[PDB]
């Protein structure tokens, strides 16, 4: 419920040029500045534009801004792959005296080389279940777009309670890890002739299986 | 130039947190500050402002009457008073700054590096450290599962720090419990299972909690 409207997400192949608009009245886009900002998975924002039109020293001459009337659009030409990121525009707004959000768009670079998920699922310890619990710990790491479902089975059946999955995380060389957790019972674990935690990927699914024995 | 902000707050619904952002400078009267929130993978909200130089200070509808900011000149600091604290205030807070000498002075080039405020129900507890014990391709993927604790941080390292090549350390996942759990995993030449010692140092300092674990083959 941001009070400048942008779109949730824009996408373009590299090259391209990709324009994300927002829009907002009279009271704050129709007569203040509006900036922009860039902020890449897991990291602080960054002004890119600021003042309508204008690039703070050191942003690249393929990032630009306008705005006319009560919106405003930045614009990205000749977008690489190192654009992939959020952005946010904001503006004064003079109804509520304070500084006003855009709720982000996503900009997606198409056409990357996709990588599959590494997993690796690890059975309950001994001295988790002497505890009397038990956890399957599902480690899922180096893919790339960072987008996946994470389905559990006990044998060949779904399981659809006391699963825990995180959401997507940038990693370092810029690919995504995540990790998903099942919760059992030592009973539920070694009744079971195995359990299974499938990762699908773009389409494709990568299964690990572990077993009480 | 440079804003340092104060470390991670906890608190239970209904009590108040104070965050601080130190500016580098040698005054605050040449820059106008902000404080904007962001939820876990949600957008950027500006909750207030301050113009040192002008004793102004601004705020967001949404949190008037729950919000303060202040500014210590003689420190060259910037508050944050976020009192009535909810469960949905969960979020990373920072404080950023914009040379000037509200619209013409509000704007955001210099960021802090972010402080966490988690607002919960639930009480500080120690982790539970259980060993992942350990293939393909000659080598072996060995771990440790860092169970139910609150609040966050917990750090992980191997070896004292002496091991770092092939760790992930995975971000936590925050049950439905109310409680997280996080894991670490090193991927290790399987040869090395039948000498070299793995252990990994768990710290969870809410607790002054340190746990090192060792790990060995089944």
């Known amino acids: 419920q941001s009070i400048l409207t942008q779109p949730p997400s824009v996408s373009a192949a590299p090259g391209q040029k990709v324009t994300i608009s927002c829009s907002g009245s009279?009271?704050?886009?129709?007569?203040?500045?509006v900036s922009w900002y860039q902020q890449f998975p897991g990291t602080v924002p960054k002004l890119v534009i600021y003042?309508?039109?204008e690039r703070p020293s050191g942003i690249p001459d393929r990032f630009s801004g306008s705005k006319s009337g009560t919106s405003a659009t930045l614009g990205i030409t000749g977008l690489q792959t190192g654009d992939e990121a959020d952005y946010y525009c904001?503006?004064?707004?003079?109804?509520?005296?304070?500084?006003?959000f855009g709720g982000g768009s996503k900009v997606t670079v198409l056409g990357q080389p996709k990588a599959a998920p590494s997993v690796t699922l690890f059975p309950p310890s001994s001295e988790e279940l002497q505890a009397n619990k038990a956890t399957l710990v599902c480690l899922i790491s180096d893919f790339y777009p960072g987008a996946v479902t994470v389905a559990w089975k006990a044998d060949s059946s779904p399981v659809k309670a006391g699963v825990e999955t995180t959401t997507p995380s940038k990693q370092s060389n810029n690919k995504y890890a995540a990790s998903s957790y099942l919760s059992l019972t030592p009973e539920q674990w070694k009744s079971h002739r195995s359990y299974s935690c499938q990762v699908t990927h773009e389409g494709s699914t990568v299964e690990k299986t572990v077993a009480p024995t | 130039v440079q804003l340092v902000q104060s470390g991670a707050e906890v608190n239970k619904p209904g009590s108040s947190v104070k965050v601080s952002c130190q500016a580098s400078?040698?005054?605050?009267?040449?820059?106008?500050f902000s404080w904007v929130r962001q939820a876990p993978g949600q957008g950027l909200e500006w909750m207030a402002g301050?113009?040192?130089?002008?004793?102004?200070?601004h705020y967001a509808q949404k949190f008037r009457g729950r919000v303060t900011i202040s500014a210590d000149e003689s420190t060259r600091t910037v508050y944050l008073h976020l009192r009535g604290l909810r469960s949905d205030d969960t979020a990373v807070y920072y404080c950023?700054?914009?040379?000037?000498?509200?619209?013409?002075?509000?704007?955001?080039?210099?960021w802090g590096q972010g402080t966490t405020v988690t607002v919960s129900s639930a009480s500080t507890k120690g982790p539970s450290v259980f060993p992942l014990a350990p293939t393909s391709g000659g080598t072996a993927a060995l771990g440790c599962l860092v169970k139910d604790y609150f609040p966050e941080p917990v750090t992980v390292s191997w070896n004292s720090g002496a091991l770092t090549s092939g760790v992930h350390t995975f971000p936590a996942v925050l049950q439905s419990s109310g409680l997280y759990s996080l894991s670490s995993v090193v991927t290790v030449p399987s040869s090395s299972l039948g000498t070299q010692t793995y252990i990994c140092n768990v710290n969870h300092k809410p607790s002054n909690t340190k746990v090192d674990k060792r790990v060995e083959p089944k």
């Open positions: 950023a700054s914009n040379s000037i000498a509200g619209g013409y002075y509000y704007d955001m080039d210099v």
């Open positions: 400078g040698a005054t605050l009267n040449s820059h106008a």
């Open positions: 301050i113009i040192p130089i002008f004793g102004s200070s």
């Open positions: 009279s009271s704050n886009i129709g007569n203040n500045d």
């Open positions: 003042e309508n039109n």
């Open positions: 904001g503006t004064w707004d003079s109804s509520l005296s304070a500084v006003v």
